Design a protein around this ligand. Sequence first.
Ligand code: GTP
Ligand code: GDP
Ligand code: MG
Lengths: 267, 94, 426, 432
Amino acid sequence: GDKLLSELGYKLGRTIGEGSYSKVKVATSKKYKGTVAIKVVDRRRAPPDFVNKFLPRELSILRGVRHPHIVHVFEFIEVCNGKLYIVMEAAATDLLQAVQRNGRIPGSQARELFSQIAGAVRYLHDHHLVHRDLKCENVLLSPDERRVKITDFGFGRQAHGYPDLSTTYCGSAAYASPEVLLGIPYDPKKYDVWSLGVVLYVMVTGCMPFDDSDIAGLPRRQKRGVLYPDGLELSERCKSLIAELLQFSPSARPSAGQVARNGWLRA
Amino acid sequence: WRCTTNENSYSNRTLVGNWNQERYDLKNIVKPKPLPSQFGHAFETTYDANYSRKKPQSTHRFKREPHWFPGHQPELDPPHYKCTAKSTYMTNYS
Amino acid sequence: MREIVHLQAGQCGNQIGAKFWEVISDEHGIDPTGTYHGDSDLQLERINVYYNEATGGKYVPRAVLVDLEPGTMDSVRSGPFGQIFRPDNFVFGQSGAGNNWAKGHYTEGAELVDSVLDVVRKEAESCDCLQGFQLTHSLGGGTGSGMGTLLISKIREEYPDRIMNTFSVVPSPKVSDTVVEPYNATLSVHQLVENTDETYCIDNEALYDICFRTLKLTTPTYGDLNHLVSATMSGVTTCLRFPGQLNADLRKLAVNMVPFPRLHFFMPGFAPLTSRGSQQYRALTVPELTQQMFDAKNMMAACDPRHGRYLTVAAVFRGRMSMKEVDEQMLNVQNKNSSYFVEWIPNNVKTAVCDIPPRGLKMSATFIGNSTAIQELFKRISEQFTAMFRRKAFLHWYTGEGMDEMEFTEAESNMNDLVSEYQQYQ
Amino acid sequence: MRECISIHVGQAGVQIGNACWELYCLEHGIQPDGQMPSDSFNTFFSETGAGKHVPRAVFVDLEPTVVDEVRTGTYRQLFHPEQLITGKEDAANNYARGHYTIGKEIVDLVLDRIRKLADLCTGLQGFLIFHSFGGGTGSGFASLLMERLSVDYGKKSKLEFAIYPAPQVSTAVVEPYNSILTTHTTLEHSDCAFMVDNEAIYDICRRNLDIERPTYTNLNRLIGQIVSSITASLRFDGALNVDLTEFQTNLVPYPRIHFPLATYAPVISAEKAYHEQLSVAEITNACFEPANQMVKCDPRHGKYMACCMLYRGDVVPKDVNAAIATIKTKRTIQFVDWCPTGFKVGINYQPPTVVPGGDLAKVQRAVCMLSNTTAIAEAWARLDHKFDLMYAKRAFVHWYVGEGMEEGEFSEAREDLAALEKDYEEVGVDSV
Ligand SMILES: Nc1nc2c(ncn2[C@@H]2O[C@H](COP(=O)(O)OP(=O)(O)OP(=O)(O)O)[C@@H](O)[C@H]2O)c(=O)[nH]1
Ligand SMILES: Nc1nc2c(ncn2[C@@H]2O[C@H](COP(=O)(O)OP(=O)(O)O)[C@@H](O)[C@H]2O)c(=O)[nH]1
Ligand SMILES: [Mg+2]
């Protein structure tokens, strides 16, 4: 189970981000002279979805694309008896845990982290690739909470253009869209474009906008109009930005080109 | 939805409708064209001389081939691979 | 060796049949007279499949030309390849059926079948090993919908092991040329479902969609739509006639196609369809064929496969090419539109390869498709029959041939059951 | 003296036969008409009374067209019209057709030709049988002739080269069926089998040889190179000659585990070979790489059980032994607890011969590798998964039922493959 890793001095401990078939256990290393986070995958116990028909899609994105504020894995290696680990770079904390440390983050440092993660989101969509999984638990920050690094590239797809639309409906309801949940084909870019809306919203409001408790009523509520918690102060270009990231029309939301350059984020 | 009401439907020389598709046709490219005679100086554009050249062209007949797709033009194909090909065994293992 | 017996019925059948014998003739390079005028040795190696040897270096079709109305057989013999069809195979009725399925299947069918049964048995004993039978006709005619469906009943008893596939013409919603269209259709598919190993439902309206959009033809005459059907026929058996990298035949595709014996209805297609202008921005590559293939506008039938789920798919490629760019791309088309194939069958797509391409064209392919969307057709014809049967309109023509009314009930019984089980597999 | 018999079945088998016999005749210098212009060929080629050499091959197929191509080819006078056997009707991707209706009429004549050619042979070393599991002919007919051939000659080694269906790409919908129903024959009637998929060769052609459009002939040429590298020890002299029985006995520890893995090195183009120095350490380090496996299986997930290395060309035993040690002292390559000694080196003299119109660059040295290892079980498990997903809905069963197979054999064969994966796990269980 761990004998090959024990030969490399990979005695991990420190279970972070617990899960049935995926953990973020901090490790110790000799070749890299420090610590690495280890991500496990159980190729036999886990269901086929992850194991087949999506496994090369996630690992290829974890192989090719490079950027400052993204994952940078060192190598992938494994013990013989049908397992899978991932040797990923140094990590500190995801954004949801840091949100709960103070309840929220003030806008000045918030637009700093958002310009970083919006800057990262530009790069993903230019390379004809999509994430479809952006969430505060998967938004991994820096130890000093001044840098961003999104993780869990688990729903990749080689997206090219509008004439072909995705049919797979994969997404958690806390950071979802009706075109995922109302059973209509969608533009893969536009679903991710909204994933920034809830990510920006949750980080500053302290609560997600609508209620991920009812699958059916949530789209019907979602056309009521998004509302912010009372007493919270933001910028008008950001009041716009959340309203142009959580609107029912698919393409009326700004794409990566305009989400790149916003007046408030540039300010 | 068979979008065909009462419409123009006349000679392709007027260049209306799918006139372009009519010009791209064997009969149109084997149709002869008179050479200009007296008059014709007035009927001229800037593009006729400044940005293009015009010369008299000779019209020719065609070869007969087995058309497959109703708009087949096997006449205006390059004069090779028009004959019967050979099996991969006969091109690799000789 | 693998011989094939060419059956015909219906005015639709004869003209498509005449145009098909036009298409496979130049493929073997055989003139109007009866002499081979091709060049390559392979091009005359496999002539025994469709043609029969005659004295003086002459070859004659393994033909059976049948129609109750004698007018159309005058048109076929006067065509360009008119004097190649042997006159003994022109077995004909003396009167028409008047678009009545009843007279062609029971009353006037019963006399002409014996002569038809005479010639087909001689043709069967002519060949050493017959691969199977095939027939083209119209489900909307009087003879083909009638006598032809009577014919396909008799051969199944006489030759059970031999395969039958019917390149069969289905009625269209908007282009409706006859008011007694539903009754013949509902009384002929009921014969198909029991006695047919594989059906090809070709629609003339969908063929009009190809000319108007894919080829931009302004005046589509029947000789054009008859070409496209003939193009489909040769593309089915091209791997049978010529060597290929991975050979296949009617048998390999038929076994690779029928998951349950009641589901043998298919949507055909043809790959290299370009307008007259389109030759200028194009490059003959297997990517350009397959993109054209699965796009629903290309289809030869009147149903959008986007609304259904594809069960099984076969593509018979024709020409010289490498394997994996086919193989990657049928993998590619499988993975991307994963919603439209069934999940309880992996690798729904079948591929076959023939080395010899069609003459004067570098690369071609033919697509045969089984999807859920064909059920969308059968509910439409059931919709329109019931609204007319419920008033017992036009009925006295059919009851004038002595036939009962339970068969009307029993025919619709199968269609509602057929769409019932077909819906279960969605 | 040692003798091979080749028993190629189906279109895949006969095309492999074309490739391999073209390679053999070029290697020995045999003209296509069949004469040496100027007795290592007596393993394969036997003289006639007219001083012309004929091969010890039988090509059988249930469709006539592909063999008729060979009958009309440039080797029309190299093979006998007798050793080329065709059927008027074919199996058409149906194990039931291939096993009970069409195979009965012709297994007698196939056995007759095999018996005659074995009578021609004096010392018959064994049988190499080339077929595919996806094809109805190559599965059913091969299985029934296997059943009859074992009882005709129990003692002769019966080695199998077969085309395994690739994990993602396949050329049928109903191939997992015939794959499962041929496992009974290939388990109870094979001493060692060499399943390959075409997808790994496609990746190898894209990956090493830079060819961006290979046809079937290129994979066939690679497989022909494999079989020539296998039989080089019989054909030519060498320091450590390894015939069939040696490597079969040292590759099969248990009767129901006889599924090793093929590997070749070096595979590289002329443009790439001109710039790269090639050594024994080079080619063996290339051999022990997961990216060069002829099947889609990662042996880093599996436990090496027995490796047989065949070196060929300007090879030196010093370089061999240093190579083997620089394979052993590495943690990423693991060996099973009960197999401390795990390598089978045989040495030949004759360097590989490059065929004109080939792809492989001419090299002075080459190595083939046959590795029994446990990672192959995942492929059978995936095939089990797809078989169960088909059998639950009971698709395509009526074809077999009407042809004359009883449906309970489906459940029996599923249970058989389950038992095989269970005992693969049992062998993987540690001996402490
Ligand atoms: N590598 C390789 N595989 C081949 C080749 N030819 C055929 N195959 C394989 O053979 C499988 C199908 O079997 P075939 O040989 O075509 O047909 P068959 O074995 O004679 O069985 P039937 O179709 O019933 O006649 C395909 O899935 C191919 O993977 C070849 O030249 N090279
Ligand atoms: N596609 C196509 N359809 C045709 C052609 N000729 C006739 N039809 C169709 O055949 C149908 C009538 O068939 P019919 O002559 O009554 O068949 P019969 O009674 O058996 O001889 C019409 O609906 C036409 O659409 C043709 O050349 N091409
Ligand atoms: Mg075959």
